[PDB]
Design a protein around this ligand. Structure first.
Ligand SMILES: Nc1ncnc2c1ncn2[C@@H]1O[C@H](CSCC[C@H](N)C(=O)O)[C@@H](O)[C@H]1O
Ligand SMILES: Nc1ncnc2c1ncn2[C@@H]1O[C@H](CSCC[C@H](N)C(=O)O)[C@@H](O)[C@H]1O
Ligand SMILES: [Mg+2]
Ligand SMILES: [Mg+2]
Lengths: 248, 248
């Protein structure tokens, strides 16, 4: 109805490529299937995000909620792949003409880390690194930037954090977050980012776990929530993502 | 950038698929080339229009001009292929929340006509029918409708005119046009539509010839303009399209 609604709606359909409905890579529990892209259950060969429409909608709800309710801070995604969700997020801010917040785009830009003997047992058991070729996960900072540019959204309110989260997170140059989107799939990535980034999540802000259904990740989420006495309700989004809103 | 500007801009980039940059069919004067899609010089394997960005921009200018300047009537495209330009056109109306105008989508829905002995010599010399398989031109009404749906724009303000223009135009159910977009490539298609549709083009409205560079088409345009004493300035868009604005 409003121009904002149309843009954002179109942007969602575009980053997920509902428009042209590109094939999926063959991997894990897996030709374009509408119910699969709606819920983010597939591995797109061309689309700029894999999170699907329910998680895009969630992301929109979180950012919009924040802006409306005056929650201060930036938006950060840890694990961006081709950048779609961050593109969308920069889109949301452009739509409401916000020039005081930034979208932080954090990634190895090389896919999943090789497993070390440091790594948590579960992260070792699933070796997400092996699925990198199969799902075209290694995606360079340059490629990601190009994609932003294609939507007309690459600019000084998009900043990049190339590197592993353990290295890039503790000392990253943002002061406060309104939305923290975790999409690392592993215990390590999730723990790395909750540990070093969650403290900067403004009260009122939102924490999103993209793959709560993965046990390694779920473990980290609870270990972290236990440790800090966090009891904010965990709300499901689709078949794998959840989020909570931080109270004081 | 207001929400409207973003939406329309994104829509243009989307129907022309600047976002994902699909391959071109190999034909005529012909891998994605940016300068070619900008000007509508290639034959997209996936994109929803082949007219490129300059002609989309032209289309936008014509529709916006009309709305602003109170020019009454609908929009009609004769020759829509996969529907992109009509999709965009329906988009424009949605963006400004217009519910009193319709987008008319006219086509064989089977590609170019087989050549008969009726046909104009030039249309016979060309036999545009032969390029149908090569450029995936035959596109069913159903397929086109699906595409509209994918942008969330298939609704009761989009009406279809399946058939050859000879048959569909003279008796088509629209009373007045604000924009008439002719994209048939041939003398026949152009003449068919100028003859039977142009008289309903409101004064102030716009007539767009997509293929003025094709001699058969150019012939029809002049023959028609001379016959009716039309001297409205012919303005070039890119390497092949032109348009004029109708005065009284
Ligand atoms: N320890 C770590 N540090 C930094 N980046 C990591 C990491 N572990 C995984 N990643 C990255 O996280 C991403 C996982 S997929 C992320 C999908 C994305 N949110 C979307 O919208 O489609 C990959 O880009 C991968 O390179
Ligand atoms: N005499 C005629 N009557 C009806 N349709 C015709 C016709 N001659 C050609 N066509 C149709 O006109 C189209 C030419 S291609 C048009 C491209 C389209 N405007 C875009 O935006 O990409 C083809 O789809 C073909 O099916
Ligand atoms: Mg994930
Ligand atoms: Mg043409």
């Amino acid at each position: 109805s409003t121009g904002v609604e149309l843009y954002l709606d179109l942007l969602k359909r575009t980053v997920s490529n509902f428009i042209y409905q590109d094939a999926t890579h063959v991997a894990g529990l897996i030709a374009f299937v509408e119910e699969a892209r709606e819920s983010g259950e597939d591995y797109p060969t061309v689309a700029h995000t894999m999170i699907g429409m329910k998680r895009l909608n969630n992301l929109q709800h979180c950012v919009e909620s924040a802006l409306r309710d005056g929650v201060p801070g930036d938006v950060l995604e840890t694990g961006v792949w081709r950048g779609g969700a961050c593109i969308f997020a920069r889109g949301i801010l452009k739509a409401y003409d916000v020039r005081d917040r930034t979208v932080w785009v954090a990634d190895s830009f090389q896919g999943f880390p090789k497993i070390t003997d440091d790594d948590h047992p579960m992260d070792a058991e699933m070796n997400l690194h092996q699925y990198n070729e199969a799902v075209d996960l290694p995606t360079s900072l340059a490629t990601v930037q190009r994609n932003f540019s294609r939507y007309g959204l690459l600019d000084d309110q998009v900043r990049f954090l190339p590197g592993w989260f353990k290295d890039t997170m503790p000392t990253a140059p943002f002061e406060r977050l309104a939305v923290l989107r975790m999409d690392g799939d592993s215990y390590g990535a999730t723990m790395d980012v909750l540990t070093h980034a969650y403290p900067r999540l403004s009260p009122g802000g939102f924490a999103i776990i993209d793959d709560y259904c993965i046990p390694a990740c779920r473990e980290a989420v609870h270990e972290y929530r236990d440790r800090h006495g966090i009891s904010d309700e965990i709300v499901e989004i689709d078949r794998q993502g959840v989020y909570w809103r931080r109270s004081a």
